[PDB]
Design an enzyme around this catalytic site. Structure first.
Site, PDB file in Angstrom:
ATOM      1  N   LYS A   1      38.561   7.667 -80.593  1.00 20.97           N
ATOM      2  CA  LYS A   1      38.910   8.834 -81.401  1.00 20.97           C
ATOM      3  C   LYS A   1      39.025   8.522 -82.869  1.00 20.97           C
ATOM      4  CE  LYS A   1      41.711  11.247 -77.886  1.00 20.97           C
ATOM      5  NZ  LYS A   1      41.109  12.582 -78.234  1.00 20.97           N
TER       6      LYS A   1
ATOM      7  N   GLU B   1      51.205  14.399 -77.603  1.00 20.18           N
ATOM      8  CA  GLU B   1      50.370  15.020 -76.557  1.00 20.18           C
ATOM      9  C   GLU B   1      51.225  16.099 -75.863  1.00 20.18           C
ATOM     10  OE1 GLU B   1      49.428  11.188 -74.669  1.00 20.18           O
ATOM     11  OE2 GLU B   1      47.349  11.557 -75.117  1.00 20.18           O
TER      12      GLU B   1
ATOM     13  N   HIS C   1      46.247   1.298 -80.348  1.00 17.52           N
ATOM     14  CA  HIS C   1      45.761   2.508 -81.042  1.00 17.52           C
ATOM     15  C   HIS C   1      46.443   2.787 -82.375  1.00 17.52           C
ATOM     16  CE1 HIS C   1      43.971   6.362 -81.694  1.00 17.52           C
ATOM     17  NE2 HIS C   1      44.985   7.093 -81.278  1.00 17.52           N
TER      18      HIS C   1
ATOM     19  N   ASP D   1      31.645  -8.481 -52.572  1.00 15.87           N
ATOM     20  CA  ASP D   1      32.951  -8.932 -53.008  1.00 15.87           C
ATOM     21  C   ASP D   1      32.767  -9.688 -54.315  1.00 15.87           C
ATOM     22  OD1 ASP D   1      35.508 -10.217 -53.303  1.00 15.87           O
ATOM     23  OD2 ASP D   1      35.787 -10.419 -51.162  1.00 15.87           O
ATOM     24  N   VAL D   2      33.472  -9.224 -55.338  1.00 15.76           N
ATOM     25  CA  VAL D   2      33.372  -9.794 -56.691  1.00 15.76           C
ATOM     26  C   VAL D   2      33.949 -11.180 -56.817  1.00 15.76           C
ATOM     27  CG1 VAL D   2      33.246  -7.597 -57.896  1.00 15.76           C
ATOM     28  CG2 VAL D   2      35.476  -8.577 -57.411  1.00 15.76           C
TER      29      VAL D   2
ATOM     30  N   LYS E   1      49.221  18.881 -79.319  1.00  6.00           N
ATOM     31  CA  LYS E   1      48.321  17.741 -79.296  1.00  6.00           C
ATOM     32  C   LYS E   1      47.840  17.432 -80.713  1.00  6.00           C
ATOM     33  CE  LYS E   1      43.907  16.111 -77.551  1.00  6.00           C
ATOM     34  NZ  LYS E   1      42.844  16.344 -76.539  1.00  6.00           N
TER      35      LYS E   1
ATOM     36  N   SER F   1      32.629  -2.919 -54.015  1.00  6.82           N
ATOM     37  CA  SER F   1      32.801  -3.379 -52.647  1.00  6.82           C
ATOM     38  C   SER F   1      32.367  -2.379 -51.581  1.00  6.82           C
ATOM     39  CB  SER F   1      34.273  -3.732 -52.394  1.00  6.82           C
ATOM     40  OG  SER F   1      35.072  -2.568 -52.438  1.00  6.82           O
TER      41      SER F   1
END
Ligand SMILES: [Cl-]
Ligand SMILES: [Cl-]
Ligand SMILES: [Cl-]
Ligand SMILES: [Cl-]
Ligand SMILES: [Cl-]
Lengths: 445, 454, 457, 457
Positions: free
Chosen positions: C170, C204, C228, C83-84, C319, C42
């Site tokens: 990953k 994490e 995941h 504008d979508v 991690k 936009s």
């Protein structure tokens, strides 16, 4: 094999009840080919002994043929004397290059003195000795007897005769397990969840009440017979066809079994047992036992084994029932789980056979499917002893292990539960299997 | 999700209707399982009474016990509509007789070149929305023809509206064989290459080509029984367990089997023709069409790799029986000892037809004898197959109807033998077939005598 | 067939700034961009202003900046503003896209705009030979995922839909299959006859650095578990595919999920790290979890009776993502010494970072017994977040669907997690740098203790 | 019950001078000698002369010499001179040794003297609480071993007989058992369903350095195969013992041998290294083998159908003893890529030196596949010859029979090897430092090639 049969105790009760009949039947089947020397203290002639043998055979209900008996009498001689006296054995030495089988149907306190005397007279070198049960009533007594015999006999000259073992289909059960890959594949803890062994006799103590009351069900059937049956079912395959190869495998089974827990052992006594002649009015002796054990090795760890044996139960049957696990998984789908899991059932006696229980769909019905197939004890043992076939005779190492196993229950026996004749036994035996598989109705002929 | 509530049969005056369909309807009526009207369609310019007469004679001709009251109930459900299936007028007429409130099953007992035109015409007349269509075999004669036919049907029908009717499949104990394999741990534990060494599939019929010689001569044993029936059987025996209870869950597992199978090697396929076949009316005097086939295949996955699968099927063999015979390995080791190895290994035998059952063959010692022990049980029901299929189709039960992906994989499997057929071997009627089928299993397990019903 | 044109909706947004520009730059450096790129947003800016934005975004990440590389990227880039929700934007787009094009449309925009964009691409006839890659999230529960999906499938086939989840980038999908299916020493052990229990750990060692408002509406379960970690489990647990394609692989994953019962909320522990409520955008009274520990199972022939424990969370000590499989002890012989180590053998798969496998065994040296660690590497390190992201973009462009969850799996995993979403258990606080709430220890009380994860050296 | 007196027949001989004195010295340094030692020989010397000889022998071996340690050893030692065929020696010995003693009689004497010595100990009533350790050889074939054995068993129980074979001292009997029986990951693999083939390699990187005349009458088969290597195989292949004692172990080893068929002489390759005939004592036309390669099998439930190849020899490229177990490939899926490495998984056991285990697997990294070596150590290094010797002496003294072959195993192994002794196949020459005759390659044609052995770093 032996080429001469020498029977100590030829005028005693077992000779009268069983031995004479068994010899007669072997003669009828043309299986006696060698002389028989009877020995006892009675001061009688050979003719008197023959009269005693004739009557004993007829009394059993055996079909009597005079020509058959006359062949048997032709083989028989008689020697009277005192089994503690060296003169008897000098005389025996004149009647005996022989390969004798000495069969001792005599009181157990005399086994050692007889054998020690046979040794002193140099009569053991090519011999075997078969001893009638009992050969011990606990670990210490069995060890003491055994030490005295082994001082003069090798283990392979000793044949411990237990009539129950004569009922065991030793070769046939091995072939069933070891020649059929469909069964061998199932025969471990990855398929089997639980084992129940049932030995039921539908009669009470008919005779020798005084003798039974000093023995009891544990000593009578569990220590030797049923544990030997379990070993046959549970053992690894022998590396040869000989008796020692078989006994090596049995001993391994017992070595991996912990001693019984007396708190997991239920003792029963049938109502009326105390009125049997010879039985004490206040007897604490069990005519029934139910117990839990296990085999703690690679094949059977964690598989509970329940055993029950007793007099005056509803049927005569000996069974080994093995429960499989259910097929694992898929609780979220229909038609994957029958109400009872598959079972392998082995009837040991009578009329031995195998039943495989499965489940099947027919229409919108599901039901049990029974896949059944088939696969004297005293004469069998006697013939085997004579021919040196030791498969049916427990070896010393197994004896000592099985005594170790049962000893705690002998030392701290649990309280007697009464049960009615013709029932399955005390209700406390049901509690033994509470979180497990219920005792099933046995597979009858 | 809903069963049909109207049966519409294209080809009601044809041979299959006469041989099988009318009888099958009559038997369903006798069992009180017909609850809905039936509209017969054909080109013949006849009245309803004439059609009823035809139906009556057809049923009696089969040897079925005839009860007039039962027949009268069936007649009461039946109407007739005459017209040509390539004429749009027929379908306008059909549209007046069938409302949007119906759920029709259209059963097409018609030549396969007409399946698409009929279905395309049903579509143009808006008659398919709540419908299913059951198509009589054949539905293709090779991979390409099956793909083309299928593309035309799928342009106007979803896969689940398409029911490919193969009478042989009606004999298959689909549920019972699953229960046998998946609910019994004693069998599930044995059901892989660690216990099974080899599989033999035998489909024998003890009769020749009794009718429709001209049809058979264009088809042959491979197309007739192997492509669909026997390969579907094998898949049932070999598949991994479905993760759901529906027909599509079942068909997902069957398809996975076929995807691990290599195409057939024409050099490992033995083709036979029984002596006298060329004298059957409609058969060409120089026909090289096979009435027997024996082949070797495999399923190259974790469960079955290295297990050879031999299959034989044929006309004019010694018995009528279809079996899957599974050979176990011997108990390993101890060759130096007697009495550890019976002369033959244990076997699991599944009789598919007739009188379906299972036999477990073991060995036993009695005295100094060793002998075979047969542990036998019956499962499922003796097949009837036509009525079972018709009923299932009507109720939307798709278990007995091969799905498109399986159809295409099995055509892939058999195609090389269709493209480059091996030379014909003659065999005598009543024999087990050409001797070259013995050579197929040389070095493996000999073809055994099949387990016959008592 | 790969795409030959990349169209990016949302090219001026946060994800473009944090990741997309850098990823395109890196692909350009590796000479892997061969086609034009049309940016859409936009913002009323020029192409030059967009290039400045792209330049700064790339430099801000710490990426080594080479101006010649950047100039090649700029040469491929055009920009289209509008504008979508308006058809005019799509008419304009239709001029830039030829009737022979095979576009990839990559939507890094708010999810409420996915359907309107795709519906507008359809109305303008721009979806033939197209694929559409949608940025996470694509639903926040079963019902919302089904609704979104129904709107997309009205105009797209499943195989044109690529659901982008950076975590999946990953996953060593090919390498873990090879590990399992090509090594008989492992395949023999890979079922309930050998394996007693499975623990999946995703840790994490950082909190929520940005987009607190976004995380607070999502939570750990939706963020890492639903897609995941359940996808990782499926890779570990599935039967082998019968073919090498993506749909063969996705057939096997779906089968796993179909044999899993929905989660038991009583066996689910929810945590929130101390300080989370002071993160900008997070509500002061938030009950959103930054940590979860749970129990599940796969009720089939391979895995029935094997408990599967899973823990995932922010602000943990390290991690690492690990799948730890415990073997049964060798059975029997309790009456003998030296037949049983203090812990049973274990197979450990480090999924991220620095993927590898550890086999834990026991050994005797003199009258000592000790653990033996048999370590090896497989696949490649995808720890740094940029690597996964570029891998997914490249795969999407080339039509490789292995790393993109398929609809049937999405719906099964939402069914599995729904009960925990509906009846969330009470929040347990835990300290940053700890392993999480102590209630996660109670979860495994009659089972194997949570072990220290296998870290990279 | 351990012994409390050590009586060494042959204390002035070569083995005493090369090994025994040094071994006693080392045990003394480690403070492991606690009882008197009586040396016996024919030499007419004094105790001091013996000590001087012992001192020199020890110093000659390169052992670090400490006078205080030696003096402790000397303090335990007495000497008795006499002839082992004379009854007077044993009357004298009977004075020195009480009816309450528990002697270990160690016979480092020619084998023709074992029976006469033992028979004389019996006539003098000196065996009741005794054990007798006999130095190799104890037979050169089935019949000679049976005859020797019958003479010993006439006066000794089997458990009083210790047959000393220095090679056995290298065997990691407890540690290999632990490896197998305490690790389920390995126990699951340890049968014909996973293992396709076994190779045993015993390589020594030296020739016949001493006693050529002795070796020329023995040969490789009798030297290393009959006892050592077959005992190693049995350790690898046996069922688990039901107890920790030596007889329980020996019960399991015997069971292995009982399921082995006798060797096929047509599947046995015999080698002789070039230069062997120039070794002093070796006949110029000797056909004695310094190398053997053979094929055998164990025909039981665990191993039926698994070919076992064995090779042993002098003057090979390295000093290493290895048991290499090849697994089957993962079955199936030949029509798919990346399901089958070029070589199947392998389990490798280095027995000597520096014992350890290697698990060979395959791994994917990018579009590369490569071998992965998972290495670990177990037990302790017994490479240097003195260690195995002292280990055996100590064990013999303490009545630990685990390293001493039992009679039933001896007889089965002689049965196994006898056909090759009766019908030896033609000698193939090979170069020193080579892997042996090329005919050993032909042996495994159609099976797995002989691999390069796993050497210590
Ligand atoms: Cl169960
Ligand atoms: Cl076989
Ligand atoms: Cl944004
Ligand atoms: Cl292989
Ligand atoms: Cl080599």
């Amino acid at each position: 094999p032996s080429d001469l049969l020498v029977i100590f105790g030829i005028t005693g009760d077992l000779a009268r009840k069983m031995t004479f009949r068994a010899l007669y039947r072997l003669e009828r089947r043309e299986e006696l080919e060698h002389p028989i020397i009877g020995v006892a203290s009675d001061d009688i002639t050979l003719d008197q002994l023959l009269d005693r043998a004739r009557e004993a055979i007829k009394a059993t209900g055996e079909t009597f043929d005079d020509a058959v008996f006359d062949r048997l009498a032709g083989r028989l001689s008689y020697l009277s004397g005192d089994v503690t006296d060296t003169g008897l054995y000098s005389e025996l030495a004149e009647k005996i290059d022989s390969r004798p089988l000495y069969y001792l149907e005599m009181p157990p306190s005399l086994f050692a003195p007889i054998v020690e005397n046979l040794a002193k007279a140099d009569l053991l070198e090519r011999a075997r000795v078969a001893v009638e049960k009992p050969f011990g009533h606990d670990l210490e007594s069995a060890r003491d007897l055994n030490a005295r015999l082994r001082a003069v006999l090798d283990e392979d000259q000793i044949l411990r005769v237990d009539h129950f073992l004569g009922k065991q289909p030793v070769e046939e059960l091995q072939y069933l397990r070891f020649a059929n890959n469909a069964l061998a594949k199932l025969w471990d803890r990855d398929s089997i969840s639980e084992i129940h062994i049932t030995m039921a006799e539908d009669f009470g103590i008919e005779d020798r009440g005084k003798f039974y009351d000093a023995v009891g069900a544990v000593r009578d059937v569990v220590q030797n017979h049923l544990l030997q049956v379990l070993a046959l079912v549970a053992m690894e395959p022998p590396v040869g066809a000989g008796a020692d190869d078989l006994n090596d495998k049995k001993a391994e089974v017992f070595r991996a079994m912990p001693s019984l827990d007396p708190e997991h052992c239920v003792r029963g006594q049938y109502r009326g047992y105390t009125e049997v002649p010879g039985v004490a009015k206040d007897s604490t002796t069990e005519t029934y036992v139910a117990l839990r054990t296990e085999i703690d090795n690679w094949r059977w760890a964690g598989v509970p084994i329940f055993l029950r044996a007793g007099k005056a139960l509803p049927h005569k049957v000996t069974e080994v029932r093995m429960f499989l696990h259910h097929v694992p998984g898929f609780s979220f789908l229909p038609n994957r789980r029958p109400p009872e899991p598959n079972q392998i059932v082995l009837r040991i006696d009578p009329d031995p056979g195998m039943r495989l229980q499965l489940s099947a769909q027919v229409g919108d019905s599901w039901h049990d499917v029974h896949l059944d197939s088939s696969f004297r004890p005293y004469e069998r043992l006697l013939y085997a002893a004579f021919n040196g076939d030791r498969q049916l005779f427990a070896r010393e190492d197994a004896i000592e292990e099985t005594w170790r196993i049962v000893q705690p229950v002998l030392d701290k026996p649990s309280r007697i539960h009464q049960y009615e004749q013709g029932s399955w036994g005390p209700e406390a035996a049901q509690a033994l299997v509470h979180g497990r598989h219920a005792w099933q109705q046995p597979w009858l002929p």
